[PDB]
Amino acid sequence: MVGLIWAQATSGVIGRGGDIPWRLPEDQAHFREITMGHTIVMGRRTWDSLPAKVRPLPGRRNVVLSRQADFMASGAEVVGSLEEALTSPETWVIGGGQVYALALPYATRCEVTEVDIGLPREAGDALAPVLDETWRGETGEWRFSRSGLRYRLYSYHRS
Ligand SMILES: NC(=O)C1=CN([C@@H]2O[C@H](COP(=O)(O)OP(=O)(O)OC[C@H]3O[C@@H](n4cnc5c(N)ncnc54)[C@H](OP(=O)(O)O)[C@@H]3O)[C@@H](O)[C@H]2O)C=CC1
Numbered sequence: 001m002v003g004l005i006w007a008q009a010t011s012g013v014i015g016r017g018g019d020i021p022w023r024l025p026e027d028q029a030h031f032r033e034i035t036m037g038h039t040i041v042m043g044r045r046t047w048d049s050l051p052a053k054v055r056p057l058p059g060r061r062n063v064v065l066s067r068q069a070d071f072m073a074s075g076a077e078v079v080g081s082l083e084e085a086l087t088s089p090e091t092w093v094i095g096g097g098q099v100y101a102l103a104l105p106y107a108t109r110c111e112v113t114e115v116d117i118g119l120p121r122e123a124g125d126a127l128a129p130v131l132d133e134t135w136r137g138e139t140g141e142w143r144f145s146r147s148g149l150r151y152r153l154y155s156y157h158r159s
């Protein structure tokens with residue numbers, strides 16, 4: 001199984017300037033819960049976005065997708081292709097915008113956190129993948145983050 005997990009503003013932005021313009025501590029815990037014990041596949045720019053203190057993310061097989069044959073990610077696996085990374089029972093693609101789109105054909109689950117931040121789309125932003133007709137969503141309650149933004153969980157499944 002391959003899943004995608006991302007947080008987006010209502011507009012669809014997931015990243016800007018190489019990072020995320022919000023931090024919901026409740027979303028950080030949900031990500032650990034859903035990913036713990038499994039393979040996380042991330043692009044090179046998102047691995048760069050991980051603080052060196054926290055990477056690799058513990059309890060998980062960190063796989064970094066890159067076109068650089070010399071790029072090294074200490075404590076992670078660097079592979080040049082996405083399915084070179086899909087050899088475990090359950091795989092989660094943890095970003096970013098480029099790898100979400102590259103992994104969407106392989107994906108049957110999208111765990112999406114919608115952050116009620118009014119953030120207009122702008123050039124150079126990373127955007128969430130477009131989910132087509134095949135995706136069925138189940139929606140959760142609007143909840144309050146301690147960071148002051150509303151959020152809610154969207155679970156997308158497809159056969
Ligand atoms: N809101 C959220 O939940 C999340 C937000 N983000 C944000 O997303 C942004 C980064 O996303 P983005 O800019 O799209 O970059 P990515 O994280 O998707 O990494 C892209 C890189 O991966 C390599 N790559 C891309 N396609 C391929 C391919 N077919 N084969 C092999 N390698 C490939 C390349 O690395 P190389 O150039 O070295 O060859 C490319 O530069 C950041 O702001 C991040 O914080 C990240 C995770 C989730």
Ligand SMILES: Cc1ccc2[nH]cc(CCCOc3c(C(=O)O)cnn3-c3ccccc3)c2c1
Nearest residue numbers: 005006007027028031032051054057058094095
């Ligand atoms: C890369 C990525 C992609 C999509 C995502 N959606 C939700 C998150 C929250 C991620 C928290 O990731 C973690 C861990 C952990 O997962 O164990 C330990 N520390 N950090 C951590 C990381 C960066 C800053 C500060 C703390 C996310 C992350």
Ligand SMILES: [Co+2]
Nearest residue numbers: 033034035036
């Ligand atoms: Co699990």
